[PDB]
């Protein structure tokens, strides 16, 4: 059909089979990239602005405000071009020069900070400098996020694997795909799968904490994932397994798959995909359906690493 | 389902309505940049291979070799390696070196010429070094570029648009996308649309034929299109119109997509909608569904004047 704006056509995204990763077929990729703004974040983008709708909270002249790392903020963005909302966008000057022109040409109002809680802090003071026209929408918490992963993302890993799928592999940053995900195909088609969430071994805070131990983040270079604490929308009972990356491994794993699969992914996407090999080629694993997320694509990280 | 390797996962991109073109929503866009490569050509580079397999001058061993202007080369280098072909591109220093970084990171061995028709004659040199290891695949002759739309992008636009569609507005590089998007829908579910092609005013070879004036190409700033010359995958005889845009309004169209629409367009994709809004704001199209081809997004062309 024709759908009435952009935030309506988010999602649907495709299931690859790797042929250099895994043992005989068994690891397939959902290409995210292939969404509105080009990330797994267009739905959250997409259905955080429409439950504030349905809840009152956003309204006609209401304005966005809010502080992203980057995918969240570009996803925003378009919903609020797509459906009329102003929006600011909290950025220190941390930030590609590549995000600065993209949500500028997003029409995006931007400050400055100088790094995430120093700009997170100061979209705070905006808010609170006028709480009837600022409405903040907070990735972290907000419910909306893992929901549309529950109504979205999972049942199109069920119907797409035909409910053959018995692992699913994700990243965590603020945990909403692999909680609602992992709630859909668990608790709405019921089947026991194996969740697997991925984070940096430099910042290990999820194994950290379920292990009892000291909670110690650190740097890293994997962006999107990885965010130094554990978020309020990572449903951690649902997180059967943590698999650790280190930044080198991920980055070398994304340029395998450009150069080995013909798929452009993230640094992210490297991440995941070397976690799921591992899994895949454990004995216990070798003939299970292993589905992993790919959150973003390869060219809004031109100016990285990953070249 | 489960596609075997990225190039299976060609196509099926939505339609979104607009809302500050046209005139009630009759103006409608198919967002191609959301691709296996994330433009138009994913398409091509697949069929084209496709059907060199299926008729044998492409097997194993043989090396695809081939001269671009960007789109093509990175849909070909996708799919060469997602099928496990080695592939060499030609490439003056012409080039954004976004492309040739990102080419490099899809696996290709390039070269240099220092324009278009100097960058030709050295792919075919190297052709001729070998022609039993190198295959050239000639975007501008052949048929399965066209093929593939008439099988994929035309049938998609007939069955989102249940029939309705009445004008097809597309710009023309090689002219497939129009020629074959025009068969799929005059000829095989027999409706008789307007198909529409666009070109700069800067190049206006098509018009200057069809009016049989003096051929005059000039250079312009509308990445993918007016190549200027007539390509043999225009089939002319399936063209209703010719509509020009000027450089200057592709980008500023361009950058209304996106700040107004939430829609991360290319260069082309304003050229192409400019043309579409001043049919659509003539009575006689008024209430015609008009449905526009949006080849390539937003961050291809971060390092150009659309930023």
């Given at each position: 059909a024709i759908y009435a704006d952009n935030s309506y056509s988010i999602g649907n995204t495709p299931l690859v089979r790797l042929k250099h990763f895994g043992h005989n077929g068994n690891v397939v990729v959902k290409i995210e990239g292939r969404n509105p703004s080009y990330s797994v974040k267009c739905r959250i983008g997409a259905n955080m602005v429409?439950?504030?709708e349905k809840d009152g909270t956003l309204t006609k002249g209401k304005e966005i405000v809010d502080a992203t790392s980057g995918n969240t903020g570009i996803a925003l963005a378009y919903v609020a071009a797509a459906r009329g909302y102003k929006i600011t966008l909290t950025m220190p000057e941390t930030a590609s020069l590549?995000?600065?022109?993209?949500?500028?040409?997003?029409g995006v109002?931007?400050?400055?900070?100088e790094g995430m809680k120093g700009?997170?802090?100061?979209?705070?003071?905006i808010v609170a400098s006028d709480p009837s026209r600022y409405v903040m929408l907070k990735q972290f918490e907000?419910?909306?996020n893992p929901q549309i992963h529950r109504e979205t993302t999972g049942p199109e890993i069920w119907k797409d694997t035909d409910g053959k799928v018995d692992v699913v592999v994700a990243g965590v940053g603020t945990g909403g795909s692999i909680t609602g995900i992992s709630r859909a195909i668990k608790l709405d088609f019921g089947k026991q799968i194996t969740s697997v969430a991925v984070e940096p071994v430099e910042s290990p805070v999820?194994?950290?904490?379920?292990?009892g131990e000291e909670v110690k983040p650190g740097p890293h270079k994997i962006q999107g994932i990885g965010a130094?604490?554990?978020?309020?929308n990572l449903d951690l009972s649902i997180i059967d397994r943590v698999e650790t990356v280190d930044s080198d491994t991920a980055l070398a794993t994304a340029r395998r798959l450009m150069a080995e699969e013909g798929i452009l992914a993230g640094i992210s996407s490297g991440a995941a995909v070397a976690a799921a090999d591992?899994?895949?080629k454990l004995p216990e694993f070798a003939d299970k359906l292993i589905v992993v997320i790919l959150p973003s694509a390869s060219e809004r990280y031109l100016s990285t690493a990953l070249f």
């Open positions: 429409w439950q504030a590549e995000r600065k022109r993209l949500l500028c040409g997003l109002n931007l400050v400055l900070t700009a997170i802090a100061k979209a705070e003071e907000n419910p909306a999820i194994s950290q904490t379920l292990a130094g604490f554990i978020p309020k591992r899994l895949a």
